[model samples]
Target: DILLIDTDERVRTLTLNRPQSRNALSAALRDRFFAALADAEADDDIDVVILTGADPVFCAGLDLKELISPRWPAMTKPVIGAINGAAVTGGLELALYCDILIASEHARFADTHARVGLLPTWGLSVRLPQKVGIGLARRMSLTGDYLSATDALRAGLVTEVVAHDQLLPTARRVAASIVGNNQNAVRALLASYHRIDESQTAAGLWLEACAAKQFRTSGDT
Candidate 1:
C-alpha cells in the first residue's frame, strides 16, 4: 500500500508508505491519498488529521523520473504535518499544504525544482511565500536551497521541531488537543482563517464578522 491509515481519538493519520522510493508522491498513491482524505472528510468521527511520510525520509517530491497529478480538496478538519526526514521539492509543498507542521530535528527541506528544470505542481508558488516570507521563498525557489528543520522553524515554516523518536507522539498530542475542542467552532474558525487569508484585509474582516454573526444564530444545537 502506498498509503497507510490509522485512527485514534478522532484523529486520522495518513502515512505515505513508499519508503523504498523515499515516499515520493505517485499515481496510485495520488488517488489513494485523495480518496482516503475524502473518506476522512465525510466521516464525522474523524475530527482532525495527521499526514506523514514513512521512515528514512519524508518525501523526495514527484518521482521526477516519472510523470505527474490532486486537487487540494480543501479539508475543513485540521491537517497536521509530521515531517520525519527530508522533504524535497514537491514534498516540501505537501508539508506546507497542511494547516500546521511539526518536524523532527532530523527533518530537512529543499526545493530543487529549479535545479532539475521542473516546476512546482503543488501550491509551492503561493503557499511557500505565504508561510515563509516572499524573500525567503524566492531564495529557496531560485537557488533550490535546503532548509534544516531548525532553519524552517526560524523561518516560521514549521511550528515545532522535536527529536525524531517523538515526532509522531507530538503530532498525536496536538491532534488530541484539537479533538478536545468544540468542533464546530474549531472548524468554523479554521475555515475563516483560510477564507480570510484568501481575501483582502477589509473583505476578510467583513467575512469573519458575518460568519460569527451567522454562527451565533445557528449554533443553537
Candidate 2:
C-alpha cells in the first residue's frame, strides 16, 4: 500500500508507508492521500489530521524516477506533518503544505529542487515566503540548506521537536486538544482562513503557469 490510514476519535493519522522510497511523493500516492483526506474532512467525526511516515525517514522528496515524466496532481485540504526524518525537495514541500508541523528530534528539512535542476510545482515558492518571510525562504530555496530539528523550530518551520518516540503521542494529544473545542467555531475559522489562503494560492499558480509558458517559449529548457 502506498498509504496507511488509522482514525481514532476525532484524529486521523495518514502515514506515507513507502519507506523504500523514503516516503517520496508520487502521483498515485498523492491521489490516494488526497482521497483519504477528503473523506476525513467530510466526516463529521474527524477534527484534525496528522501526517507522518513509517520510521527513521519522514520523506526524501518526489520520486525522481517518477517525476522524470512530469506527472502530478492537485490536492485540497490541510494536513499536519509529523516529521519523522529528513525531508528534501518535494518532501519539504509536503511538510510546508501542512497546516501545522511537528517534528521529532531526528527530523531534518531541506529543499533541493534547484540542486536537481527543476522547479517547485506545489506552490512552495509562494507559501514558503508567506510562512517564513521572503529572505529566509529565498536563502533556503537558493542554497538548499538543511535544518536540524532545533534550527527548524527556531526558524518557525515546526512548532515543536520531541523525542522520536514521543512524536505520534504528542501529535495525537494536540489533535485531541483541538477536537475538544467547539466544532462550529473550528469550521468557521478554517473556512475563513481557507478563503484567504486559497485565493493567494490561486494567484500564485496563475503566476507560475504564466512563467512556465514564457520559459518554454524562450527555449530555456
The candidate that wins on TM-score is 2
Maximum-lDDT candidate = 1
- lDDT (Cα, tens digit) per residue for candidate 2, span 23-90: 87788887887678777777776778899987878888878889522222332334678999998877
lDDT of 2 at 18: 89
- The parts of candidate 2 lying over 4 Å away from their true place are 68-78, 216-221
Instruction: Provide the lowest-lDDT 10-residue window in model 2.
Output: 68-77
Cα misplacement distance, residue 58 of candidate 2 (Å): 1.5
Q: Give the range where candidate 1 is weakest over 10 consecutive residues by summed lDDT.
A: 200-209
Global Cα lDDT for candidate 1: 0.84
TM-score of 1: 0.87
Q: C-alpha displacement of 180 in model 2, angstroms?
A: 0.4
- Local accuracy of candidate 1 as per-residue lDDT tens digits, 61-86: 87765663336676789999999999
